[PDB]
Design an enzyme around this catalytic site. Structure first.
Site, PDB file in Angstrom:
ATOM      1  N   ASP A   1      40.420  32.858  46.619  1.00  0.00           N
ATOM      2  CA  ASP A   1      39.970  31.984  45.479  1.00  0.00           C
ATOM      3  C   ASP A   1      41.371  31.207  45.161  1.00  0.00           C
ATOM      4  O   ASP A   1      41.678  30.704  44.098  1.00  0.00           O
ATOM      5  CB  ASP A   1      40.015  33.113  44.008  1.00  0.00           C
ATOM      6  CG  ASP A   1      39.064  32.528  43.145  1.00  0.00           C
ATOM      7  OD1 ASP A   1      38.653  31.399  43.315  1.00  0.00           O
ATOM      8  OD2 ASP A   1      38.788  33.300  42.172  1.00  0.00           O
TER       9      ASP A   1
ATOM     10  N   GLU B   1      36.095  31.287  49.069  1.00  0.00           N
ATOM     11  CA  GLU B   1      35.986  30.962  47.788  1.00  0.00           C
ATOM     12  C   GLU B   1      37.144  29.984  47.188  1.00  0.00           C
ATOM     13  O   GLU B   1      37.887  30.187  46.276  1.00  0.00           O
ATOM     14  CB  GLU B   1      35.870  32.086  46.784  1.00  0.00           C
ATOM     15  CG  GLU B   1      34.946  31.818  45.601  1.00  0.00           C
ATOM     16  CD  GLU B   1      35.154  32.653  44.360  1.00  0.00           C
ATOM     17  OE1 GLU B   1      34.521  33.685  44.396  1.00  0.00           O
ATOM     18  OE2 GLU B   1      35.952  32.430  43.385  1.00  0.00           O
TER      19      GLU B   1
ATOM     20  N   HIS C   1      28.871  30.816  41.883  1.00  0.00           N
ATOM     21  CA  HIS C   1      30.290  30.973  41.512  1.00  0.00           C
ATOM     22  C   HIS C   1      30.225  30.927  39.695  1.00  0.00           C
ATOM     23  O   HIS C   1      29.230  30.513  39.380  1.00  0.00           O
ATOM     24  CB  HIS C   1      30.972  29.822  42.025  1.00  0.00           C
ATOM     25  CG  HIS C   1      32.497  29.846  41.767  1.00  0.00           C
ATOM     26  ND1 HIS C   1      33.003  29.532  40.592  1.00  0.00           N
ATOM     27  CD2 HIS C   1      33.488  30.308  42.469  1.00  0.00           C
ATOM     28  CE1 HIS C   1      34.182  29.555  40.848  1.00  0.00           C
ATOM     29  NE2 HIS C   1      34.657  30.006  41.651  1.00  0.00           N
TER      30      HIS C   1
END
Ligand SMILES: [Zn+2]
Ligand SMILES: [Zn+2]
Lengths: 352, 352
Positions: free
Chosen positions: A300, A10, A171
């Site tokens: 992330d 991600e 997302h």
């Protein structure tokens, strides 16, 4: 103990020519002391974030466009050109590091046929591993049209995902328009991870469930970040409400409704990542419900710090192993689930 | 191991004269086979729901106006009159069963001072135990104006809650206006418990936290239903984001922000109920974070069935006791936490 070769998926970028747009995201999501690092990372897929990934035992990073990315571009032709530019850019960047980098397609989601064609180009011609789309596509001359992908016209796109056999990562994105003004203006620090992001993604994926997307496409694979965007804590309540109210009510009207229990979709069609959620206790609860084979490590970056996310997973290896069911489960979450899901061959530190 | 004398406190009614308005709620929330029971219960606080409560070991029911109730009445003068009528009506009904019924004030939340005065009347003159308000107060055409209580003018109202020393129950409500059209038209079965309800309440109470309401009013007491409206599963992620991004960013701008960690507010100012969330596993996770003394049993009648909610707590007593930390914790959640929080004297089966 800890492992190397972790897969992290991600991990966002923006086109370098749009550096000015990243300062606007910085004002939503980045504390002052973290600005210098954010700007370097978001604009340099092969820069210091790669060195940190190497130091901290990441074996394979899958890059994706940041948010909203194309989903915030309200003019279709401009949006389609931007998505193509993002894909061509990241393809060029990852070309020099094939043993440790891949990418997910950026897509304009104004038109199902066009999005299907760009995903096909990314997978078949560029070797991308799936798509990552930032929630609803905004559209119209003033951006108020909200395009959700749980409506029937999107079936051609889901069929493409299944034909290519690649996952769709749904997302989050910030609020827009009247929703931003009415519901966030007086609590702007709740834009992003604190609540707004998961509120949108959970609505959208539950929309895919209740509108039958996974019933029509049982082989479709969807990924959710942030340990499932509020849904696991509500697994009981949502399924109970579907049994007690929604299923018989929809049936009585002849309305489409999900054919299977909520957890069926989370045990067959949906995978969760640990992005921005370095929580052993929350991870344990998720494992207990969906299985250790359905959760993937992720950081992330650059909104989160690679050293922090890897530090959690690495430094607490023994405690995490107890929480997730042992050494194999820990290596599955760190690396081997994603290796199998994305059909990765050997990659950097992949057997280490 | 089951107990009688349980306290149940998310139990809704409507004014009998507005029976027709309950049909719209039935179309959102009630399966056809459950309509007859819903209509009987919502309009009769002393009817069969009292018989079921007596049978199933409830000692004290706290009644509240259903949703949106006054929060959907967009004209201030009419909203204020309706709230007063609700309070006078329920006061009259509970007068006949003082040992096993109480009430929370219905309030028009168009004006902080006016709501403070009505809450004071309910507590001081009618003996009510707190307020129950259905999320934001709507105003304007179609309810498009959203009035949140985390803005500075609402300090007048929070000071009143502290002066009276009674809690404020922040209950959900459906979407209105452009948000309803844009985000729910294509997924209408997600209106209510599946996601929309908790999305709104969590935004609102996190708004109170980040705007400093609990820092300026550290004695303020707030109750959330449904085991905390998505927040517990995200305790780690929200607090981490506040530390990594929001608090230093707000401090750098001189913007108000929560002074303490998220869990401080959930261990000092906020209590959770089990309404509509008869989940031993979710209850265990919440207990592990906020303490068994901060969770209260409740059913959510008439949208949930008293026999189902009490059946869960009673029939699984041994497993629940083990999950929540023993007999005292089980009796605390069933009864004694609420007995102490609302300062109930002796009541029906209260020592059982
Ligand atoms: Zn992200
Ligand atoms: Zn309720």
């Amino acid at each position: 103990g800890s492992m190397r070769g972790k897969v992290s998926l991600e991990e966002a970028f923006e086109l370098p020519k749009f550096a000015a747009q990243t300062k606007e995201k910085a004002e939503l999501y980045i504390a002052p002391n973290n600005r210098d690092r954010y700007f370097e990372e978001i604009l340099n897929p092969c820069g210091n974030r790669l060195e940190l990934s190497n130091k901290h035992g990441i074996g394979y990073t899958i890059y994706s466009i940041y948010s909203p990315g194309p989903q915030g571009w309200t003019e279709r032709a401009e949006c389609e050109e931007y998505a193509r530019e993002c894909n061509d850019y990241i393809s060029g960047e990852i070309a020099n590091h094939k043993d440790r980098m891949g990418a997910f397609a950026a897509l304009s989601m104004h038109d199902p046929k066009q999005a299907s064609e760009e995903l096909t180009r990314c997978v078949k011609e560029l070797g991308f591993l799936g798509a990552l789309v930032n929630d609803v596509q905004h559209a119209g001359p003033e951006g108020e049209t909200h395009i959700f992908y749980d409506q029937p016209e999107w079936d051609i796109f889901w069929q493409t995902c299944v034909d290519l056999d690649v996952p769709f990562y749904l997302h989050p994105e910030p609020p827009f328009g009247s929703y931003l003004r009415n519901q966030y203006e007086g609590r702007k620090y709740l834009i992003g991870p604190p609540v707004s992001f998961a509120n949108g993604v959970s609505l959208h994926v539950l929309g895919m469930i209740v509108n039958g997307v996974f019933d029509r496409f049982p082989k479709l694979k969807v990924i959710l970040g942030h340990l499932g965007e509020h849904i696991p804590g509500d697994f009981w309540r949502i399924e109970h409400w579907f049994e007690h109210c929604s299923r018989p009510l929809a049936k009585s009207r002849g309305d489409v409704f999900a054919e299977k229990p909520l957890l069926h979709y989370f045990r067959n069609n949906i995978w969760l990542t640990t992005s921005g959620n370095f929580s052993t206790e929350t991870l344990k609860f998720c494992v207990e419900h969906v299985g250790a084979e359905r959760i993937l490590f992720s950081v992330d970056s650059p909104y989160e710090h690679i050293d922090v996310g890897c530090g959690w997973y690495d430094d607490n290896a023994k405690a995490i192993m107890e929480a997730v069911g042992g050494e194999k489960a820990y290596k599955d979450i760190g690396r081997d689930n994603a290796k199998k899901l994305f059909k990765l061959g050997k990659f950097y530190d992949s057997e280490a």
